[PDB]
Amino acid sequence: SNINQMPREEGIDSTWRLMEEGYMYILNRRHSFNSDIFETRLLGKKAICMGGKEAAEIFYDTEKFKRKDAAPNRVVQTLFGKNGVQALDGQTHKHRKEMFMSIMSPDELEKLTDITKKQWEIAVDKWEQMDKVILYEEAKEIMCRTACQWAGVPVQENEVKRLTKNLGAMFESAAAVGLKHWLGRHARNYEEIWIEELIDRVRDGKVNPPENTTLHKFSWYRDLEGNLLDTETAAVEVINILRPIVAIAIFINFIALALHHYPEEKEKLKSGDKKYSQMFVQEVRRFYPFFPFVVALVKKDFTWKGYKFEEGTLTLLDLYGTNHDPEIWKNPDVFSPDRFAKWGSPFSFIPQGGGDYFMGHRCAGEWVTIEVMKVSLDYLTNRMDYEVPDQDLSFSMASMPSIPHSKVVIKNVKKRI
Ligand code: HEM
Ligand SMILES: CCCCCCCCCCCCCC(=O)O
């Protein structure tokens, strides 16, 4: 059939509009163009942006889209690391992804939840002897201690503080400009070298992590040819566990926000029926902004909706806008856990990617995230009391990630006993 012209945003480069609008950039234009797909110019080149469940399923078609060389270098050097799983395609990707999925078994997730609970207890005891407590910063430290213990990474106290700062900077810098962006580049450089040394100690026999742990599994994994991963690559992969675990602190912020803003939803949790906590956690992941979009390159020319996708074109999948799509969800722009009662598809609810864990790039740590969020919600509701003082809890849709301006201050913390 005839090739049609995709809706097109004019201007020599539109990256500035993405920087100004953030999470809302793609959905605003899906609305104004009356199309789930449009073309623009971002980072000096043509770009295609698309959202909704059909677009998501097409984006996850690995005959049509590849990840090699898709992410901008500025994102590789902050968020991802070079030559990690995010960069791979085909059987090489499948085999690397199996390494990540191998640490996600029932017994290992139980180990994670036990650690997470203990580290919450430790933090709460500390906060009870404090006055004001900055939840985002304290939660990053909870999650850094949890990550290192679960991963088998030995850390001294000074190393905990430094890692918490540097892992934070890696994700807080990825969509930043200027001075702030470079903090994350330097943070990544420092921890890559530190983790590389540690992996060399594992391989030399001088450190002996338990067999079940990330550090053991990633240090000893062999590729499709039977060879150990390069030390640099294995370090990037370990950081691809430690960093996103720290990042759960962003979702902890939003759990606390939701408990403060929605007392009727909090009261439904006081029952002990786990269905309510499950719905609440899912709705936090659906409603609040976090990972805006993912990127791929067109692998081979193809047609969809009458439009030509040309090989090599950078393509953005709108995660935020799909999670807020009024063609998928009833009243998408309100927080309503009841929408999940006995719950859509793997392409419609995509805060941590869509599709299949093994056949695509969907987040390896989605179950970790959900389980950590459940522990955190249980702590904040059932194991402590605190006050939320008057403060600026607003969160900007132009900042990625989006953090409430006050960083969520709590006070008068008391552990229930
Ligand atoms: C804290 C909140 C998190 C969010 C919002 C999040 C979101 C995402 C998204 C959107 C992707 C990319 C999907 C794609 O490329 O198609 C991804 C990939 C990934 N995530 Fe997460 N994630 C989080 C936590 C975690 C955790 C806790 C872990 C590890 C325990 C983790 C490990 C990974 C890995 C290894 C990948 C790359 C998978 C691949 O390329 O095949 N993430 N995540
Ligand atoms: C490829 C688009 C980059 C988007 C900008 C990053 C803002 C969100 C931070 C996401 C962190 C998710 C977990 C992680 O990978 O550490």
Residue numbers in the entry: 2 to 344, 346 to 419
The paper states:
However, CYP152K6 purified from an E. coli expression system was crystallized and its structure was determined to 1.3 Å with tetradecanoic acid bound. The protein crystallized with a single monomer in the asymmetric unit and showed good electron density for the entire protein molecule. An arginine residue, Arg244 in CYP152K6, is phylogenetically conserved in the CYP152 family of P450 peroxygenases, and makes strong hydrogen-bonding interactions with the carboxylate group of tetradecanoic acid. There are also extensive interactions made by several hydrophobic residues lining the active-site pocket that further stabilize the alkyl chain of tetradecanoic acid. The bound ligand is positioned in the active site in a binding mode that is above the plane of the heme, and with the Cα and Cβ carbons of tetradecanoic acid in close proximity of the heme iron (at distances of 4.8 Å and 5.5 Å, respectively). Interestingly, the distal water molecule is also within hydrogen-bonding distance (~3.0 Å) of one of the oxygen atoms from the carboxylate group of tetradecanoic acid. The alkyl chain bends by ~90° around the C8 atom of tetradecanoic acid to produce a well-defined structural “kink” in the lipid chain.
The CYP152 family of cytochrome P450 enzymes (P450s or CYPs) are bacterial peroxygenases that use hydrogen peroxide to drive hydroxylation and decarboxylation of fatty acid substrates. We have expressed and purified a novel CYP152 family member – CYP152K6 from the methylotroph Bacillus methanolicus MGA3. CYP152K6 is a previously uncharacterized member of the CYP152 P450 peroxygenase family which is able to hydroxylate at both the alpha and beta carbons on its fatty acid substrate.
